[PDB]
């Protein structure tokens, strides 16, 4: 029934701040209610320290809060291996602990921002040990994949080629949310040239809510946890859909709401509106889940998804006749009551595997090999407990999620 | 965490006095005065650089390491000089002779063992050690030899926690001294070797850019120091408060040496305008990044219109937008992608605190890892041959119980630490 | 002139037998190996020599070490590396008992005939050193005392004033008891009984020829010979012991790492110039005269059927590759 969550590495908490607010938001649950279900891992205190210090500051146990004052690094190895090391035991005994306290649970949606030290390196141990001690659940990641080019670490890719490889092996659906195209959402579909990462943080906050939230609440087409990653992944590897929200519409500028079924769907799969610069250059999707939310009348879908169907320039694979899975709930979305946000009835979170990350990856794979061509950073891993073999031995990974991606589309 | 500062030499000494007039006030920390601290936030992380003991005492946790009593008798007896608990002072009253050797082999090791006595009260102080700040100047006894001997045995006490240095590097146009080369050659040769981030400040490329970005027409010494201590305040210190993307010592250290020599950077500040006329507030972003990527305004002598990059850390700490932030990085990095290196897709290491220079809205530190500093250590490498030909002043050295092969040492290492440099501005 | 490479593969032990696991490794050829795992890559490797399992100790010795000595005639500097994971068959293959001489036995009693026969010819007289590498510090092995100063020569040339080589041989004797003496002396961690490291270590030979006419003065041909014993690198996650034992294997990997550096430089290198850093660690420092222009050398590549041997086998023989492969 349950899905704890664990909000890793300084953005995944942050992120997790912000979903955890959106949350409480729409279930009249003031600062001081009832008690969340989820941890927090970061290997820098002072970040913690800000949902220990601001906001939503009583909300949590100082149990569910784990830091480990020592050092972040924006190294994988470090983080994985070295330092986050010594954190693990004691993060898992937390999310074993909140494990046996609920009733038959269903997984864990897990927080991460892929380039990062605590975000990519401890992670990638914390699902390790997941897929173990749990490898009878659900293991639904959240992750916030580098910037197409604006991204911040000068290392990045080294951390993030090494968070997909040990992480695919034992993710169940890998959700993904771009920073950057996050940002042309809030520049061409909201108007703002002040986006805060607060902001960014309150859209993850709110495609997120729709994912959990209402949908592990009642409606009229209910979808598990485990729906999705069956209607959802083909294939074994931990496969990345990407997030999408519809009414993104700026609570202030234009007001056309009033946007039925017929446009929010359809905004769905313009580009421009994805949250992922993964813009479906050829990638074939092979598996959505329209999970709407609001005043929703299931023909109206059954017909604006026939549409779709019929469209043919957004061609879905060969080998999937259908692939639509219609979540519905009942609850309209519940924006945040001054940020930026339209406030709409309804909306349309879709999310989607698409041969399109075929491109991201590869794109993101060229990066680390450019550096790894000339060893760049790497005397900062190897003195942390890696060797020439984590780095080309994940290079080789990543190289068949490339031809994997590729053989699963583009043929008939 | 925690750092411990060390003011090496008499210049180290008088921007230790710079360094914590600044960051004591960038803490609310009065002469022996507490926390008086406009805000609340200037509190929850000080440890970093101080020490609890009574309760409005907290005491800055450096060392101060002279052979020249009338310096730190100078420092101890102005403005914020009485703060240093005695203990700190590590003087050494014997001739402060203007000697690298006299500083590192023959009177600055007898006062070392009474040094890392204290370094060591210092770093087991409490919680956890992140690593060392470490002043000086490479032209003199106490500032290369004595300064550069800290840090051979501070390295080899905790290879773990980082070592900062910063350096003043022998100015070129004039020296301040006539062995200078001598005294720098030999310190640059411990620091490639030892300390893993270095700084390096040029006190004619501070007068330029305090006499031309500051209309300041008599720039005392007070003032170039001043501004050094501004920078190392937006590096350390600054990265000790929160921000939207945080970085601390090693992020900075983790992404800006691709190779161990250590490599030395170019520290450059933001909001650079002279007072009343100047402040034009032009400091929406745009005029933060159109500031520290220029030429003038890197306190290196040297200019990075010279010489890729191999790192760039813009360490802002001032409300603004990650997108606006993250952006102009960008359009930075593709409209000189001429000099920024290429087997790096994102040189540039944008990191953002939340809480500004007390009085100021926005600024930005600047650390950049170009390879024009080899256009540097080129100028002190040929002073020293130059000179090391006739082995000018070189009885003063080996008269103190030195060696022909540790010039020779010296130079060749530093000399090569210039060859390597060159291998990625190609 | 090139690197040579080979690889060795141990044969498993009877306790692995009794496991039964699938090889990792198949040897088609003399050249060429494959690396497993078989119903992956599937690529096929092609080296220039395989040994087996068989080879014990006159084999394995005969074919790497008999070409160095004619470049050791030369005088032109030669080396050989010898890798291997524990249990690799590391002490078999370098040294063996007195029973079955391997490659340092033989080298020593056939370059004893080579001092006869060569000696003959030109007067030589050789000596040879036993050194270390431990936390970065070079330690005799005949004398433990501080890691020597190191200065450079005038043009170059990295050198340890700390040179000693504290005793040379009149014959076979006295060397083995100094083999006795080097497993002691070089710094291992507390590891497993079964187990046992080096920290980093290499070995010596010093070649000074001068003719028989010829006085000692005159021309005279120098040549070095170095021997290595690479230690391993340690894994973080494997090791769990870190504090010493980290720092410890910090060290290596970052003398293996700036080794790499100059090995895959090599290869540019022969379209290089001085790019080649032999400053990035006291290894590549040492053997700035010996990886060599044309020098002769050689890497020893050893690992195991073994199940463990399979990651670090795996590993070391994509390296290998790498010295092969890296091309411009
Ligand atoms: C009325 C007003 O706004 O005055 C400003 C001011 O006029 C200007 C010109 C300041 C002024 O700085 C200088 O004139 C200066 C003098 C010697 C060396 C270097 C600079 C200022 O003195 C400096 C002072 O800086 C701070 O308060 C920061 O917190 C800064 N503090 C110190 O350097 C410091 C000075 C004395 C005692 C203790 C600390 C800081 C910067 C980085 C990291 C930590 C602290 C500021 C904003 C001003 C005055 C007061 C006129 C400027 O400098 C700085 C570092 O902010 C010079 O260009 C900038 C732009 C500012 O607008
Ligand atoms: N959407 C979103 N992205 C964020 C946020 N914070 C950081 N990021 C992104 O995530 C990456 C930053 O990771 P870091 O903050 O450096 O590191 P970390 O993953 O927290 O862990 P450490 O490296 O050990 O500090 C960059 O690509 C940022 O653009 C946030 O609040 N929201
Ligand atoms: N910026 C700066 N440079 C200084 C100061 N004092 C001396 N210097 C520089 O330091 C060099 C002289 O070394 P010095 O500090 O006297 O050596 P020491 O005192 O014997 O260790 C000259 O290049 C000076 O310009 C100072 O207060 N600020
Ligand atoms: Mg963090
Ligand atoms: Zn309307």
Redesign the pocket.
């Known amino acids: 029934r349950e899905c704890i969550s664990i909000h890793v590495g300084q953005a995944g908490v942050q992120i997790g701040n912000a979903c955890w607010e959106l949350y409480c938001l729409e279930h009249g649950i003031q600062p001081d209610g009832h008690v969340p279900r989820a941890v927090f891992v970061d290997l820098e205190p002072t970040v913690i320290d800000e949902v220990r210090t601001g906001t939503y500051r009583q909300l949590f146990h100082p149990e569910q809060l784990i830091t480990g004052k020592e050092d972040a690094a924006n190294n994988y190895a470090r983080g994985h291996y070295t330092i986050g090391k010594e954190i693990i035991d004691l993060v898992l005994d937390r999310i074993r602990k909140l494990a046996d306290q609920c009733t038959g649970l269903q997984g864990f949606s897990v927080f991460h921002s892929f380039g990062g030290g605590t975000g990519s390196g401890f992670t990638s141990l914390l699902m390790e040990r997941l897929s173990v001690d749990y490898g009878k659940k659900s293991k639904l990641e959240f992750s916030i994949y580098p910037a197409p080019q604006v991204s911040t670490a000068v290392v990045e890719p080294y951390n993030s080629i090494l968070t997909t490889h040990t992480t695919l092996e034992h993710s169940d659906c890998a959700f993904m949310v771009d920073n950057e195209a996050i940002y042309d959402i809030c520049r061409r579909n909201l108007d703002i040239e002040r986006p805060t990462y607060t902001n960014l943080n309150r859209l993850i906050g709110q495609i997120v809510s729709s994912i959990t939230a209402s949908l592990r609440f009642d409606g009229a087409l209910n979808v598990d946890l485990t729906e999705f990653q069956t209607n959802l992944v083909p294939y074994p590897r931990g496969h990345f859909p990407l997030a999408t929200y519809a009414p993104v519409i700026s609570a202030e500028k234009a007001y056309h709401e009033q946007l039925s079924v017929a446009e929010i769907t359809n905004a769905c799969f313009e580009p421009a509106n994805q949250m992922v610069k993964c813009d479906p250059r050829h990638g074939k999707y092979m598996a959505c889940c329209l999970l709407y939310r609001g005043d929703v009348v299931p023909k109206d879908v059954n017909a604006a998804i026939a549409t779709i169907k019929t469209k043919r320039t957004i061609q879905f694979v060969d080998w999937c006749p259908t692939g639509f899975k219609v979540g519905i709930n009942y609850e309209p979305p519940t924006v945040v009551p001054g940020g930026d946000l339209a406030k709409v009835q309804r909306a349309v979170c879709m999310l989607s595997n698409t041969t399109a990350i075929a491109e991201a990856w590869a794109r993101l794979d060229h990066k680390f090999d450019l550096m790894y061509a000339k060893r760049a950073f790497v005397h900062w891993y190897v003195g942390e407990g890696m060797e020439e073999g984590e780095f080309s031995e994940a290079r080789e990974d990543m190289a068949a999620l490339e031809k994997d991606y590729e053989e699963v589309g583009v043929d008939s | 965490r925690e750092i411990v500062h060390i003011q090496?030499?008499?210049?180290?000494n008088?921007?230790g006095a710079k360094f914590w007039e600044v960051i004591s006030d960038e803490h609310g920390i009065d002469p022996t005065g507490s926390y008086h601290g406009d805000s609340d936030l200037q509190l929850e992380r000080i440890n970093v650089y101080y020490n609890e003991a009574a309760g409005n005492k907290y005491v800055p946790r450096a060392i101060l390491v002279?052979?020249?009593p009338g310096?730190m008798d100078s420092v101890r007896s102005g403005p914020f000089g009485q703060i240093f608990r005695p203990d700190n002072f590590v003087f050494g009253q014997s001739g402060?002779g203007?000697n690298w050797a006299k500083?590192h082999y023959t009177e600055g090791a007898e006062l070392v063992d009474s040094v890392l006595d204290v370094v060591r009260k210092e770093s087991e102080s409490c919680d956890c050690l992140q690593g060392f700040q470490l002043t000086?100047?490479l032209?003199?006894?106490?500032?290369?030899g004595?300064?550069t001997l800290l840090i051979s045995k501070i390295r080899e006490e905790y290879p773990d926690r980082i070592m900062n240095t910063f350096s003043?590097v022998?100015?070129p146009k004039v020296?301040?001294?006539v062995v200078?080369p001598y005294n720098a050659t030999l310190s640059v040769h411990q620091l490639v070797e030892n300390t893993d981030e270095t700084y390096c400040?040029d006190?004619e490329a501070?007068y330029d850019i305090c006499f031309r970005t500051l209309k300041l027409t008599t720039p005392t010494?007070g003032d170039?120091?001043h501004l050094?201590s501004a920078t190392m305040s937006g590096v350390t210190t600054c990265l000790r408060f929160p921000g939207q993307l945080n970085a601390d010592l090693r992020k900075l250290a983790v992404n800006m040496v691709p190779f161990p020599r250590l490599h030395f950077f170019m520290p450059g500040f933001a909001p650079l305008t002279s007072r009343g006329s100047q402040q034009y507030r032009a400091l929406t972003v745009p005029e933060l990044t159109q500031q520290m990527f220029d030429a003038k305004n890197m306190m290196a002598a040297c200019d990075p219109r010279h010489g890729r990059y191999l790192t760039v850390a813009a360490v802002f700490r001032g409300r603004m937008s990650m997108k606006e932030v993250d952006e102009q990085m960008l359009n930075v990095q593709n409209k000189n992608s001429s000099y920024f290196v290429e087997w790096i897709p994102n040189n540039v290491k944008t990191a953002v605190c939340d809480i500004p220079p007390r009085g100021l809205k926005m600024s930005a530190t600047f650390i950049g890892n170009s390879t024009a500093i080899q256009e540097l250590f080129k100028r002190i490498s040929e002073q020293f041959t130059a000179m090391f030909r006739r082995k000018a002043f070189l009885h003063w050295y080996t008269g103190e119980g030195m060696d022909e092969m540790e010039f020779t040492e010296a130079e060749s290492n530093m000399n090569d630490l210039v060859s390597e440099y060159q291998q990625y501005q190609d | 002139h090139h690197m040579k490479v080979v690889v060795r593969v141990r044969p498993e032990n009877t306790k692995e037998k009794a496991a039964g696991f699938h090889k990792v490794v198949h040897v088609v050829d003399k050249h060429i190996l494959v690396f497993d795992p078989k119903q992956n890559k599937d690529l096929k490797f092609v080296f220039d020599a395989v040994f087996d399992e068989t080879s014990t100790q006159s084999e394995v010795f005969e074919h790497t070490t008999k070409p160095i000595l004619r470049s050791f005639l030369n005088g032109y500097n030669c080396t050989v590396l010898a890798y291997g994971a524990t249990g690799a068959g590391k002490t078999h293959t370098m040294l063996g008992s007195a029973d079955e001489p391997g490659v340092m036995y033989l080298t020593m009693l056939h370059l004893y005939k080579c001092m006869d026969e060569i000696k003959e010819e030109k007067i030589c007289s050789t000596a040879v050193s036993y050194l270390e590498v431990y936390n970065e510090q070079i330690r005799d092995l005949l004398v433990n005392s501080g890691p020597l100063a190191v200065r450079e020569d005038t043009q170059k040339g990295v050198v340890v004033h700390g040179l000693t080589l504290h005793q040379p041989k009149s014959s076979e004797e006295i060397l083995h008891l100094l083999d006795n003496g080097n497993k002691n002396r070089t710094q291992h961690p507390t590891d497993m009984n079964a187990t046992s490291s080096r920290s980093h270590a290499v070995f010596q030979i010093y070649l000074r020829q001068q003719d028989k006419t010829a006085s000692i003065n005159q021309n005279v041909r120098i040549a070095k010979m170095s021997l290595i014993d690479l230690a391993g690198s340690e894994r973080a996650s494997t090791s769990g012991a870190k504090g010493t034992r980290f720092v410890e294997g910090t060290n290596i990997n970052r003398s293996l790492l700036a080794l790499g550096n100059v090995i895959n430089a090599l290869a540019d290198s022969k379209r290089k110039n001085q790019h080649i850093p032999y400053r990035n660690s006291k290894l590549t420092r040492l053997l700035k005269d010996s990886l060599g222009g044309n020098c002769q050398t050689i890497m020893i590549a050893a690992v195991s059927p073994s199940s463990v041997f399979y990651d670090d086998t795996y590993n070391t023989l994509k390296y290998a590759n790498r010295a092969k492969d890296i091309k411009s």
């Open positions: 090496a030499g008499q210049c180290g008088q921007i002279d052979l020249e310096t402060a203007n500083g000086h100047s032209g003199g006894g106490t500032g290369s004595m300064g003043v022998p100015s020296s301040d001294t200078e400040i006190n501070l010494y170039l120091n050094v």
